[PDB]
C-alpha cells in the first residue's frame, strides 16, 4: 500500500479525536444559555 | 499505481470541499 | 404550557372542573346553556395535560379540549 502510514495516522484521529471534539463542542453549544 | 503526491492532491481538494461545506452550513444556519 | 379551550357546546355540568387535579378550570357565568355556567381555563400554566377533564366531559365530541404544546417544569410533572 502506497502511503501506508496514512491509515495508522488517520484512523485513530478520525475515530477518537474527531468524535471527542465534536461531542465536546456540541455539548457546549446545546447546554449554553 | 497511485503515488503520495496524488493522495496529497486529493486531500487538498477534500479540504477545499470542507471549507465550502462549512460555508454552506453557515449560510443555511443564518 | 398546554392550551385548554372551552367551546360553546358546554352544558355547565361542572364535571371537568371537579376532575381537574391541578386547578386549571373554573366555572364562570354564562347565558348559552340552561345551567347558566360555562367552563374556563385561566390557569393553563399549571396544566399537566392529563386530559381528565376531557374524559369527564359528557357532551358528544368534547366541549373542553387540551392541546399539548411547549413543555415546562409544571406541565412535565417534575418534582425536581
Amino acid at each position: 500500500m502506497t502511503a501506508a502510514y496514512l491509515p495508522s495516522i488517520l484512523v485513530p484521529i478520525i475515530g477518537l479525536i474527531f468524535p471527542g471534539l465534536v461531542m465536546a463542542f456540541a455539548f457546549i453549544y446545546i447546554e449554553q444559555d | 499505481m497511485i503515488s503520495d503526491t496524488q493522495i496529497f492532491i486529493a486531500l487538498i481538494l477534500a479540504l477545499v470541499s470542507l471549507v465550502l461545506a462549512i460555508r454552506l452550513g453557515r449560510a443555511l444556519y443564518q | 404550557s398546554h392550551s385548554v379551550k372551552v367551546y360553546d357546546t358546554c352544558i355547565g355540568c361542572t364535571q371537568c372542573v371537579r376532575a381537574c387535579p391541578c386547578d386549571v378550570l373554573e366555572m364562570v357565568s354564562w347565558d348559552g346553556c340552561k345551567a347558566g355556567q360555562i367552563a374556563s381555563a385561566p390557569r393553563t400554566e399549571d396544566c399537566i395535560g392529563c386530559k381528565r377533564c376531557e374524559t369527564a366531559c359528557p357532551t358528544d365530541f368534547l366541549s373542553v379540549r387540551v392541546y399539548l404544546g411547549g413543555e415546562t417544569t409544571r406541565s412535565m410533572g417534575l418534582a425536581y
Binding site: - | - | 387535579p21 357565568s29 417544569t73 410533572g77
Partner: protein, 138 residues
Amino acid sequence: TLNLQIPSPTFEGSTGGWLRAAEVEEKYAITWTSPKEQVFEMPTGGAAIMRQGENLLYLARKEQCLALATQVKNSFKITDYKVYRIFPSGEVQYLHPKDGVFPEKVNAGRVGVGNVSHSIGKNLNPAQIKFTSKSFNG
C-alpha cells in the same frame, strides 16, 4: 396570607419529599384545620398523623397538594384548606381557592379565559392558517 408559624403534622420522614428544585425553583404549601388528631396518608408515600387545629405542609408540586386536599375532603370532610406557592425570594402567591370560592361553584367577578364562540367542528383547517399567524379557532 400564609402563616409560616403554623405547626406541621407529626411525620417520621420519608425519601419521597421535596428535592433541591423546591428550594431553588418553587415550592408549594397547604394549610388546613382538623377537628381532631387523625392519621392521613401522605401524597408522597407514607402515613402521617395530623394534629387537632391547624396544619401546614410543604410539597414540591401543586398536584400533590391538591391530591391531599381531595383526600382530606372525601375522607375527613375538611374543605377550609388553602394552597399557596412560595418562591425562594420569599414571595407567597395564593393559589387555591383563588377567589375564596371553589372553582366548581360560580362566583361573581370571574371572567372566562379560553372560551370559543363556536363548536369544535367549526375550527379552521391548517391550510388557511399556514404561513399566517391566524389561530385555528377563527
